[PDB]
Amino acid sequence: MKGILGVKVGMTRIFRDDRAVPVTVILAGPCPVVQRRTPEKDGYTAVQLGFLPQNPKRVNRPLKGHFAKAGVEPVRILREIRDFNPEGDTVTVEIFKPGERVDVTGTSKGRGFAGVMKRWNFAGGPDSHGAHKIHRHPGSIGNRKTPGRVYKGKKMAGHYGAERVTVMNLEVVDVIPEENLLLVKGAVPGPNGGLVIVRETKKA
């Protein structure tokens, strides 16, 4: 397993073999390791990565201690990669070569209080023929006296998005190490400026 932190920067298409290929561009490097989780000390294996330099004027003392024991400049984001342990003190985009397949994790766009149609793709109600103030309503939510209740997990309106999403097996179209840039084919969760994680794919 191998991974990196990054920010989603935006989308384009490039040309490759007379084909237009949609890409999301990701700024991944550089991520210094700030702690290593060990089976003797932590009970599992991981690497804590830091990402994006931070004004020390904004970093409190308990945080300052953590960084210093690693001898690492103050960083804005800390995040772990599981079962990944790089030889170096620093992880960069170069761990990925074009052609590799990756898993990208981000925070989906937030739709706030979402209707039952937007959220769960319900059909809603009819728009004419007598429909009475139920054009976007969900219909029945149950049976009658048996069971006399509503199931746990009943799809209902409520918040939607702004939640952890991972899309898997994305082609790495190119990587531009001199700009800490990764070019991933297709769509990646979340807004531009969003923090994302790039891991080596789990598919075969």
Partner RNA sequence: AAGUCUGGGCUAAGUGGUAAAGGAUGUGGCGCCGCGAAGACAGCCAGCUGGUCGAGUGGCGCCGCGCCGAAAAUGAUCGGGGCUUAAGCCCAGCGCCGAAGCUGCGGGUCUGGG
Partner RNA sequence: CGAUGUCGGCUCGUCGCAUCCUGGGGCUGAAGAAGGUCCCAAGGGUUGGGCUGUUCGCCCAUUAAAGCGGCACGCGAGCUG
Partner RNA sequence: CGCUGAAAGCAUCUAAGCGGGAAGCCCGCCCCAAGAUGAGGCCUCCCACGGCAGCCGGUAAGGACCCGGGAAGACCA
Residues of this chain that interact with RNA (CB under 7 A) are 35, 37, 41-43, 60-66, 69, 103, 105, 109-113, 120, 122-126, 129-134, 137-149, 151, 154-155, 159-166, 168, 190-194, 202
Task: Please identify which residue in 52, 53, 151, 156 interacts with another protein, judged by CB under 8 A.
Answer: 151
Q: Is 152 in the site for another protein (CB under 8 A)?
A: yes
Binding mask 102-141 for another protein (x = CB under 8 A): ----------------------------------------
CA–CA dist 12, 34 (Å, integer):
33
Query: Who contacts 84 (Cβ-Cβ below 8 Å, separation ≥6)?
Result: 1, 2, 3, 45, 46, 47
Task: Say if CB 181 and CB 141 are below 8 A apart.
Answer: no
Minimum gap (Å) between residue 152 Cβ and another protein? 4
Tokens linked to 59: 């970093």
Give φ, ψ of 66 to 5 degrees.
-55, -45
Q: Judged by CB, which is closer to RNA: 15, or 146?
A: 146
Q: Is 156 in the site for another protein (CB under 8 A)?
A: no
Q: Which does 83 bind (CB under 5 to 8 A by kind): RNA, another protein, Mg ion, none?
A: Mg ion
Helix (H, G, I), strand (E, B) or coil at 186: coil
Count CB atoms within 10 A of the CB of residue 153: 6
